[PDB]
Amino acid sequence: LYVGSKTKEGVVHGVETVAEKTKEQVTNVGGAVVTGVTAVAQKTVEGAGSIAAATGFVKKDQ
Amino acid sequence: LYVGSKTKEGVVHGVETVAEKTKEQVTNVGGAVVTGVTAVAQKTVEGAGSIAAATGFVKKDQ
Amino acid sequence: LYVGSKTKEGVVHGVETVAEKTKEQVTNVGGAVVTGVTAVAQKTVEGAGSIAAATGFVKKDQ
């Protein structure tokens, strides 16, 4: 990187949400339920077998 | 990278959502349910067998 | 990269959503259900067997 300016490296911007989600009922046993706004702003992830920004994520392997 | 400016490297911008999702009922046992806004802003991911930005993700291998 | 400016490297922009999805009922056991807005902004992914931006993703191999 050098004199170059206005670097807009990963940005989550201008997220607006309006929700009238009335009368909800979430039920499970061993599962994953994700609701609502979610944002990540990673820039560099390294490593073999590395998991980044996992939502609604399930692992049951050996 | 050099003098070149206005670099717009990965950006999630202008996400607007309006939801009137009334009378919901989510049910499971070992599954994954994802609802709502989700955004990621990764730039560099390295590594063999690396998982990035996984939603509604299921693994049951050996 | 050099003096060249206004680099618009991967951007998710201007995402608008209006939803009146009333009277919903999601049910499963080991499956994946994804609902709602989802956006990713990766730029570089490297690695053999690497999974990027997986939604509604299922793995049951050996």
Coordinates of C-alpha atoms in Angstrom, one line a residue:
Chain A
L1 CA 0.0 0.0 0.0
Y2 CA 1.2 3.5 -0.8
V3 CA 0.1 7.2 -1.3
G4 CA -3.2 6.0 -2.7
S5 CA -6.0 7.3 -0.4
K6 CA -9.7 6.8 0.2
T7 CA -9.1 3.1 0.8
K8 CA -12.6 1.6 1.5
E9 CA -11.4 -1.9 2.7
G10 CA -14.3 -4.0 3.7
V11 CA -17.2 -2.0 5.2
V12 CA -20.8 -2.8 6.0
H13 CA -22.7 0.5 5.6
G14 CA -26.2 1.7 5.5
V15 CA -28.1 -1.3 7.0
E16 CA -31.7 -0.3 7.8
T17 CA -34.3 -2.8 9.0
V18 CA -37.9 -2.4 10.0
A19 CA -39.7 -5.5 11.5
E20 CA -43.2 -6.0 12.8
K21 CA -42.8 -9.7 13.2
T22 CA -45.5 -10.3 15.8
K23 CA -46.6 -13.7 17.2
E24 CA -43.5 -15.7 16.7
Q25 CA -42.7 -19.2 18.2
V26 CA -39.2 -20.7 17.7
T27 CA -38.7 -24.3 18.9
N28 CA -36.0 -26.9 18.4
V29 CA -33.7 -29.4 20.2
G30 CA -30.2 -29.3 18.8
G31 CA -30.5 -27.0 15.8
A32 CA -29.4 -23.4 15.3
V33 CA -31.9 -20.6 14.6
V34 CA -30.7 -17.1 13.6
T35 CA -33.0 -14.1 13.4
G36 CA -32.3 -10.4 13.1
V37 CA -29.6 -8.2 11.6
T38 CA -26.0 -9.7 11.4
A39 CA -23.0 -8.1 9.8
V40 CA -19.2 -8.8 9.8
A41 CA -16.3 -6.8 8.7
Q42 CA -13.3 -9.2 8.5
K43 CA -10.3 -8.2 6.3
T44 CA -7.8 -11.1 6.4
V45 CA -8.4 -14.7 7.6
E46 CA -5.6 -17.3 7.3
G47 CA -5.3 -20.9 8.4
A48 CA -6.2 -24.4 7.0
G49 CA -9.7 -25.4 8.0
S50 CA -10.6 -21.9 9.3
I51 CA -14.2 -20.9 9.4
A52 CA -15.1 -17.2 9.1
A53 CA -18.5 -15.5 9.5
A54 CA -20.6 -18.7 10.1
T55 CA -24.3 -18.2 10.9
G56 CA -26.8 -21.0 11.2
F57 CA -23.8 -23.3 11.5
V58 CA -24.0 -27.0 12.3
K59 CA -21.2 -29.5 12.7
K60 CA -21.8 -33.2 13.6
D61 CA -18.9 -34.9 11.9
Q62 CA -16.2 -37.2 13.2
Chain B
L1 CA -1.2 -1.2 -4.6
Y2 CA -0.1 2.4 -5.4
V3 CA -1.2 6.0 -5.9
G4 CA -4.5 4.7 -7.3
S5 CA -7.2 6.1 -5.0
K6 CA -10.9 5.5 -4.4
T7 CA -10.3 1.8 -3.8
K8 CA -13.8 0.3 -3.1
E9 CA -12.5 -3.2 -1.9
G10 CA -15.5 -5.4 -0.8
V11 CA -18.3 -3.3 0.6
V12 CA -21.9 -4.2 1.5
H13 CA -23.8 -0.9 1.1
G14 CA -27.4 0.3 1.0
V15 CA -29.2 -2.8 2.5
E16 CA -32.8 -1.9 3.3
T17 CA -35.4 -4.4 4.5
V18 CA -39.1 -4.0 5.6
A19 CA -40.8 -7.1 7.0
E20 CA -44.3 -7.6 8.3
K21 CA -43.8 -11.3 8.7
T22 CA -46.5 -11.9 11.4
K23 CA -47.6 -15.3 12.8
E24 CA -44.4 -17.3 12.3
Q25 CA -43.6 -20.8 13.8
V26 CA -40.1 -22.3 13.4
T27 CA -39.5 -25.8 14.5
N28 CA -36.8 -28.4 14.0
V29 CA -34.5 -30.9 15.8
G30 CA -31.0 -30.8 14.5
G31 CA -31.3 -28.5 11.4
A32 CA -30.3 -24.9 10.9
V33 CA -32.8 -22.1 10.2
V34 CA -31.6 -18.6 9.2
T35 CA -34.0 -15.6 9.0
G36 CA -33.3 -11.9 8.6
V37 CA -30.6 -9.7 7.1
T38 CA -27.1 -11.1 6.9
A39 CA -24.0 -9.5 5.3
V40 CA -20.3 -10.2 5.3
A41 CA -17.4 -8.1 4.2
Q42 CA -14.4 -10.5 3.9
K43 CA -11.4 -9.5 1.8
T44 CA -8.9 -12.4 1.9
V45 CA -9.4 -15.9 3.1
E46 CA -6.6 -18.5 2.8
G47 CA -6.2 -22.2 3.9
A48 CA -7.1 -25.6 2.5
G49 CA -10.6 -26.7 3.6
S50 CA -11.5 -23.2 4.8
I51 CA -15.1 -22.2 5.0
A52 CA -16.1 -18.5 4.7
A53 CA -19.5 -16.9 5.1
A54 CA -21.6 -20.0 5.7
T55 CA -25.3 -19.6 6.4
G56 CA -27.8 -22.4 6.7
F57 CA -24.7 -24.7 7.0
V58 CA -24.9 -28.4 7.9
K59 CA -22.0 -30.9 8.3
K60 CA -22.6 -34.5 9.2
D61 CA -19.6 -36.3 7.5
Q62 CA -16.9 -38.5 8.8
Chain C
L1 CA -2.4 -2.0 -9.3
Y2 CA -1.4 1.6 -10.0
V3 CA -2.5 5.2 -10.5
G4 CA -5.8 3.9 -11.9
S5 CA -8.5 5.2 -9.5
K6 CA -12.2 4.6 -8.8
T7 CA -11.6 0.9 -8.3
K8 CA -15.0 -0.7 -7.6
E9 CA -13.7 -4.1 -6.4
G10 CA -16.6 -6.3 -5.4
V11 CA -19.5 -4.3 -3.9
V12 CA -23.1 -5.3 -3.0
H13 CA -25.0 -2.0 -3.3
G14 CA -28.6 -0.8 -3.3
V15 CA -30.4 -3.9 -1.9
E16 CA -34.0 -3.0 -1.0
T17 CA -36.5 -5.5 0.2
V18 CA -40.2 -5.2 1.3
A19 CA -41.8 -8.3 2.7
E20 CA -45.3 -8.9 4.1
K21 CA -44.8 -12.6 4.4
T22 CA -47.5 -13.3 7.1
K23 CA -48.5 -16.7 8.5
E24 CA -45.4 -18.7 8.0
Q25 CA -44.5 -22.1 9.4
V26 CA -41.0 -23.6 8.9
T27 CA -40.4 -27.2 10.0
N28 CA -37.6 -29.7 9.4
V29 CA -35.3 -32.2 11.2
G30 CA -31.8 -32.0 9.8
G31 CA -32.2 -29.7 6.8
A32 CA -31.2 -26.1 6.2
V33 CA -33.7 -23.3 5.6
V34 CA -32.6 -19.8 4.7
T35 CA -35.0 -16.8 4.5
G36 CA -34.3 -13.1 4.2
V37 CA -31.7 -10.9 2.7
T38 CA -28.1 -12.3 2.4
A39 CA -25.1 -10.6 0.8
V40 CA -21.4 -11.3 0.8
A41 CA -18.4 -9.2 -0.4
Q42 CA -15.4 -11.5 -0.7
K43 CA -12.5 -10.5 -2.9
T44 CA -10.0 -13.3 -2.8
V45 CA -10.4 -16.9 -1.6
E46 CA -7.6 -19.5 -2.0
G47 CA -7.2 -23.1 -1.0
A48 CA -8.1 -26.5 -2.4
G49 CA -11.5 -27.7 -1.3
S50 CA -12.5 -24.2 0.0
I51 CA -16.1 -23.2 0.2
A52 CA -17.1 -19.5 -0.1
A53 CA -20.5 -18.0 0.4
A54 CA -22.6 -21.1 1.0
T55 CA -26.3 -20.7 1.8
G56 CA -28.7 -23.6 2.1
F57 CA -25.7 -25.8 2.3
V58 CA -25.8 -29.5 3.1
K59 CA -22.9 -32.0 3.5
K60 CA -23.4 -35.7 4.4
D61 CA -20.5 -37.4 2.6
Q62 CA -17.7 -39.6 3.9

